[PDB]
Amino acid sequence: TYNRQNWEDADFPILCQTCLGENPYIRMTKEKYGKECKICARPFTVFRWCPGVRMRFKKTEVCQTCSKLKNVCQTCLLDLEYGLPIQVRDAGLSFKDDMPKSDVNKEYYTQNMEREISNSDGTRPVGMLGKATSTSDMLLKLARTTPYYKRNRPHICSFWVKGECKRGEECPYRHEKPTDPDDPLADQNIKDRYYGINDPVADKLLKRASTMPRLDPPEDKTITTLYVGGLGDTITETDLRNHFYQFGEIRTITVVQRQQCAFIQFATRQAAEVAAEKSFNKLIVNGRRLNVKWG
Amino acid sequence: SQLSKQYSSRDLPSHTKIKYRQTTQDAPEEVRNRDFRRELEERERAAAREKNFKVKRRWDDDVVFKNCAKGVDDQKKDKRFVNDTLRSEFHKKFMEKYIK
Amino acid sequence: KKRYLFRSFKATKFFQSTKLDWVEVGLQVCRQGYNMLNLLIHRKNLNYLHLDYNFNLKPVKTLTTKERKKSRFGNAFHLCREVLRLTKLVVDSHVQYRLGNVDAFQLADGLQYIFAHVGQLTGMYRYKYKLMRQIRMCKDLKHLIYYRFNTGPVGKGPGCGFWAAGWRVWLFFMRGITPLLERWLGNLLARQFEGRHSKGVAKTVTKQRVESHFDLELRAAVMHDILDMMPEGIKQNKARTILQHLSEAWRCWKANIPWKVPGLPTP
RNA sequence: GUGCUCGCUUCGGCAGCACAUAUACUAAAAUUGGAACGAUACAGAGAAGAUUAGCAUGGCCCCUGCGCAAGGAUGACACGCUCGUGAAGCGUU
RNA sequence: UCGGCCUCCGAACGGUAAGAGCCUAGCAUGUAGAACUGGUU
Ligand SMILES: O=P(O)(O)O[C@H]1[C@H](OP(=O)(O)O)[C@H](OP(=O)(O)O)[C@H](OP(=O)(O)O)[C@@H](OP(=O)(O)O)[C@H]1OP(=O)(O)O
Ligand SMILES: [Mg+2]
Ligand SMILES: [Mg+2]
Ligand SMILES: [Mg+2]
Ligand SMILES: [Mg+2]
Ligand SMILES: [Mg+2]
Ligand SMILES: [Mg+2]
Ligand SMILES: [Zn+2]
Ligand SMILES: [Zn+2]
């Protein structure tokens, strides 16, 4: 009857490079208990600053305990390792964690894991760090590495949306016209983006990741000999032999300069299919961009 | 509770100092060097030392019972500490004093 | 230590300084306090209550049982409302002198009447019963001023003006009454904004709670002194039956009935 | 910008120097979700006849109060657990 | 041809149950976030 979750009173916000910006010379503001968490509603430490010039004066949304749980940004709410949504990372690696939806059970379980992190080291994205090391399987085909500043771009001038921003360029909000409200990508529930449930950006990137045949290959009719186009004479048989030595034994490693085909064939059919799925427009052998097809 | 902003008037800053025992107040510096044993036998010895025609009859002859106040003596019978309040002498005195 | 809170505010960017006429400051403070009391009304959604302008509180309509029970206030709110009514009276007298409706002798005599007739014009006694010591001293100062004044050709006319002594008395009362008011209003603000701790700090065992807490502690002592001679086994501990045996024993001692259960263990 | 120049050199500007030094939840927003509980209907005041003073106790039950005060119907709510059936373990034949 | 003494002064709780629910106020936000396409028997 005397139970409550303690308050996130700590420094060091764990932020993206994108929301972090481009300036190395950073001026900073910190509120102690100015707002509450957007998810677990603990009174957390607000971090507000200006990363660049054309700015929103960006600030943190959820608590540091929730960010320590989910390894997402405190502002951008996207995963810090890849720049991807946590729905995308949970679909890629492990989606067995979840969260309770009722407020009392959510606050009680949040107090339990807050006690767990307080007894733990402090810098750890909880239990699935041991199972999250197996990355760059497919999610790094579309995971961002660039610091994206168009989402750090400030909010839209609703007065000039109505056509009545008398300030003009003195108004620090954006004097460009807004996006489509009928577009489901514009909805973006913050609790849905936290929970990893039906985020439209995550569904759009999953639909995009279903398009490239980066590991399909297998155009040979039950034959291990896959011909990689785009190789030419730059990729020789030695690069295919060194690639297939990790997968076992190479049944047929060859280079044909007439068709620009790197003929790769492991002794095992599964190893040959794995090498073809690696080299189906997703691997470079001896400086030559390989794209697997029938051989 | 680290977060409460309600202040009772018994929660005010008051009596903030702590007095300590002086050497007149049996300070621990003299408690160590003092031995309480021969203090206790000298004080017990002090307590044991300071523990110590026509003729008529008699005019009062026309009664039936003589000398009835013979064995009447309270002494330490009231001083006997009966630890039973049904038979407590103060309780009996209370009943006769407060009941007519 | 001195610890000047005005310098503490002046160090912050939320407080600046200016130069102002005191009548304008009094009008500002009266308007501010009226807005504070209306805001406290709207915080608890007491829109069927209403403050006048002269800090008079009245229900707009009749109340239910729920609106009757929930609108019960404390001493601090009603007393500071009455204090704001008194300062509104002082500011009103200053304003009607400043418009020239009254004479300066009339403003002094009106301050004399205000300082001598505090409880006859305000409800100090309803929320703090201590203040008629100060009202008695104001009456005594009024009689001393009157009987030093009515000496020659002047009589008991209505124009006697002096206010410095009652000003001294009520402002020395004000520096007395400030921190208790601040702590009560802080507890009010903490219950308003942090909510009410329904459990909170544990209640004292007062006079109405003596026998119940004594029997509760006796029953807890019975439980602690019955759990400890039990050996290994015995599923039917029957502590409710032991409580019934003890209650029947105490009731039969109250009734002077010979209580005996021959099936009962000896210790 | 102002102040000053062994100025450029006209007496204007320019050039140099000097000091001047990083306002702001930035919205006059757009939108976003909870909502007093008034109304109506619903609704029925503890202690085994009625009339019922009450203090408790409990916890994810709260209100009013400045409460370590007192009220809110005692504020509300807060009983049902002695034989066969077999099982396995060990001891005897 | 002779001395003086002057307590006090009022408010709440405690009675016009409690519960319940539906539409309605008051009031809380001024947010975070939109990544789209190419190599061979
Ligand atoms: O001097 P007055 O004009 O004759 O009135 C005063 C005084 O009234 P004001 O303060 O308005 O002058 C008192 O009235 P309130 O203060 O109570 O309103 C009242 O008697 P108290 O002083 O005993 O309260 C009164 O009548 P009374 O002569 O019978 O005493 C008399 O008092 P003064 O004796 O001081 O003149
Ligand atoms: Mg009955
Ligand atoms: Mg009572
Ligand atoms: Mg009560
Ligand atoms: Mg009752
Ligand atoms: Mg009662
Ligand atoms: Mg109750
Ligand atoms: Zn970020
Ligand atoms: Zn949180």
mmCIF file with all atom_site columns, N, CA, C and O in Angstrom, chain A residues 222-236:
data_model
loop_
_atom_site.group_PDB
_atom_site.id
_atom_site.type_symbol
_atom_site.label_atom_id
_atom_site.label_alt_id
_atom_site.label_comp_id
_atom_site.label_asym_id
_atom_site.label_entity_id
_atom_site.label_seq_id
_atom_site.pdbx_PDB_ins_code
_atom_site.Cartn_x
_atom_site.Cartn_y
_atom_site.Cartn_z
_atom_site.occupancy
_atom_site.B_iso_or_equiv
_atom_site.pdbx_formal_charge
_atom_site.auth_seq_id
_atom_site.auth_comp_id
_atom_site.auth_asym_id
_atom_site.auth_atom_id
_atom_site.pdbx_PDB_model_num
ATOM 1  N N  . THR A 1 222 ? 18.012 -27.415 -59.620 1.00 0.00 ? 222 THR A N  1
ATOM 2  C CA . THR A 1 222 ? 18.613 -28.402 -58.703 1.00 0.00 ? 222 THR A CA 1
ATOM 3  C C  . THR A 1 222 ? 20.111 -28.585 -58.950 1.00 0.00 ? 222 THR A C  1
ATOM 4  O O  . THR A 1 222 ? 20.641 -29.696 -58.883 1.00 0.00 ? 222 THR A O  1
ATOM 5  N N  . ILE A 1 223 ? 20.800 -27.484 -59.234 1.00 0.00 ? 223 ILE A N  1
ATOM 6  C CA . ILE A 1 223 ? 22.225 -27.488 -59.531 1.00 0.00 ? 223 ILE A CA 1
ATOM 7  C C  . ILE A 1 223 ? 22.913 -26.521 -58.580 1.00 0.00 ? 223 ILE A C  1
ATOM 8  O O  . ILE A 1 223 ? 22.425 -25.405 -58.363 1.00 0.00 ? 223 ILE A O  1
ATOM 9  N N  . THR A 1 224 ? 24.039 -26.952 -58.012 1.00 0.00 ? 224 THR A N  1
ATOM 10 C CA . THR A 1 224 ? 24.802 -26.105 -57.105 1.00 0.00 ? 224 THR A CA 1
ATOM 11 C C  . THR A 1 224 ? 25.551 -24.989 -57.823 1.00 0.00 ? 224 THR A C  1
ATOM 12 O O  . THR A 1 224 ? 25.933 -24.007 -57.178 1.00 0.00 ? 224 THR A O  1
ATOM 13 N N  . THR A 1 225 ? 25.766 -25.117 -59.132 1.00 0.00 ? 225 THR A N  1
ATOM 14 C CA . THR A 1 225 ? 26.529 -24.137 -59.903 1.00 0.00 ? 225 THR A CA 1
ATOM 15 C C  . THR A 1 225 ? 25.677 -22.897 -60.137 1.00 0.00 ? 225 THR A C  1
ATOM 16 O O  . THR A 1 225 ? 24.832 -22.868 -61.034 1.00 0.00 ? 225 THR A O  1
ATOM 17 N N  . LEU A 1 226 ? 25.897 -21.865 -59.328 1.00 0.00 ? 226 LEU A N  1
ATOM 18 C CA . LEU A 1 226 ? 25.225 -20.585 -59.491 1.00 0.00 ? 226 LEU A CA 1
ATOM 19 C C  . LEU A 1 226 ? 26.188 -19.605 -60.143 1.00 0.00 ? 226 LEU A C  1
ATOM 20 O O  . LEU A 1 226 ? 27.333 -19.466 -59.701 1.00 0.00 ? 226 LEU A O  1
ATOM 21 N N  . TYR A 1 227 ? 25.728 -18.940 -61.198 1.00 0.00 ? 227 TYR A N  1
ATOM 22 C CA . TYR A 1 227 ? 26.548 -17.989 -61.935 1.00 0.00 ? 227 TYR A CA 1
ATOM 23 C C  . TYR A 1 227 ? 26.260 -16.589 -61.415 1.00 0.00 ? 227 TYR A C  1
ATOM 24 O O  . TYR A 1 227 ? 25.115 -16.131 -61.452 1.00 0.00 ? 227 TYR A O  1
ATOM 25 N N  . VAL A 1 228 ? 27.291 -15.916 -60.924 1.00 0.00 ? 228 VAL A N  1
ATOM 26 C CA . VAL A 1 228 ? 27.166 -14.567 -60.395 1.00 0.00 ? 228 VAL A CA 1
ATOM 27 C C  . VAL A 1 228 ? 27.518 -13.602 -61.517 1.00 0.00 ? 228 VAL A C  1
ATOM 28 O O  . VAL A 1 228 ? 28.676 -13.523 -61.938 1.00 0.00 ? 228 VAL A O  1
ATOM 29 N N  . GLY A 1 229 ? 26.504 -12.903 -62.025 1.00 0.00 ? 229 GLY A N  1
ATOM 30 C CA . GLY A 1 229 ? 26.736 -11.823 -62.954 1.00 0.00 ? 229 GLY A CA 1
ATOM 31 C C  . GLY A 1 229 ? 27.210 -10.564 -62.260 1.00 0.00 ? 229 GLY A C  1
ATOM 32 O O  . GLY A 1 229 ? 27.041 -10.380 -61.053 1.00 0.00 ? 229 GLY A O  1
ATOM 33 N N  . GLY A 1 230 ? 27.816 -9.682  -63.050 1.00 0.00 ? 230 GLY A N  1
ATOM 34 C CA . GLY A 1 230 ? 28.478 -8.511  -62.520 1.00 0.00 ? 230 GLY A CA 1
ATOM 35 C C  . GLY A 1 230 ? 29.873 -8.761  -61.995 1.00 0.00 ? 230 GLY A C  1
ATOM 36 O O  . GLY A 1 230 ? 30.513 -7.818  -61.511 1.00 0.00 ? 230 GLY A O  1
ATOM 37 N N  . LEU A 1 231 ? 30.362 -9.998  -62.069 1.00 0.00 ? 231 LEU A N  1
ATOM 38 C CA . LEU A 1 231 ? 31.685 -10.327 -61.553 1.00 0.00 ? 231 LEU A CA 1
ATOM 39 C C  . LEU A 1 231 ? 32.766 -10.019 -62.582 1.00 0.00 ? 231 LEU A C  1
ATOM 40 O O  . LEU A 1 231 ? 33.691 -9.244  -62.314 1.00 0.00 ? 231 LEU A O  1
ATOM 41 N N  . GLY A 1 232 ? 32.654 -10.610 -63.771 1.00 0.00 ? 232 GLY A N  1
ATOM 42 C CA . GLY A 1 232 ? 33.663 -10.420 -64.794 1.00 0.00 ? 232 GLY A CA 1
ATOM 43 C C  . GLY A 1 232 ? 34.942 -11.170 -64.467 1.00 0.00 ? 232 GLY A C  1
ATOM 44 O O  . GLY A 1 232 ? 34.937 -12.227 -63.828 1.00 0.00 ? 232 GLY A O  1
ATOM 45 N N  . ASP A 1 233 ? 36.060 -10.608 -64.917 1.00 0.00 ? 233 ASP A N  1
ATOM 46 C CA . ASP A 1 233 ? 37.375 -11.157 -64.622 1.00 0.00 ? 233 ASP A CA 1
ATOM 47 C C  . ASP A 1 233 ? 37.942 -10.652 -63.303 1.00 0.00 ? 233 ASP A C  1
ATOM 48 O O  . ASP A 1 233 ? 39.018 -11.101 -62.897 1.00 0.00 ? 233 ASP A O  1
ATOM 49 N N  . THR A 1 234 ? 37.249 -9.726  -62.633 1.00 0.00 ? 234 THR A N  1
ATOM 50 C CA . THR A 1 234 ? 37.726 -9.226  -61.346 1.00 0.00 ? 234 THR A CA 1
ATOM 51 C C  . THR A 1 234 ? 37.550 -10.268 -60.248 1.00 0.00 ? 234 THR A C  1
ATOM 52 O O  . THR A 1 234 ? 38.401 -10.391 -59.361 1.00 0.00 ? 234 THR A O  1
ATOM 53 N N  . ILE A 1 235 ? 36.458 -11.023 -60.291 1.00 0.00 ? 235 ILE A N  1
ATOM 54 C CA . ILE A 1 235 ? 36.243 -12.130 -59.367 1.00 0.00 ? 235 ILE A CA 1
ATOM 55 C C  . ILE A 1 235 ? 36.765 -13.400 -60.022 1.00 0.00 ? 235 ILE A C  1
ATOM 56 O O  . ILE A 1 235 ? 36.299 -13.791 -61.098 1.00 0.00 ? 235 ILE A O  1
ATOM 57 N N  . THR A 1 236 ? 37.731 -14.042 -59.378 1.00 0.00 ? 236 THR A N  1
ATOM 58 C CA . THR A 1 236 ? 38.325 -15.265 -59.883 1.00 0.00 ? 236 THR A CA 1
ATOM 59 C C  . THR A 1 236 ? 37.745 -16.465 -59.134 1.00 0.00 ? 236 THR A C  1
ATOM 60 O O  . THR A 1 236 ? 36.819 -16.337 -58.328 1.00 0.00 ? 236 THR A O  1
#
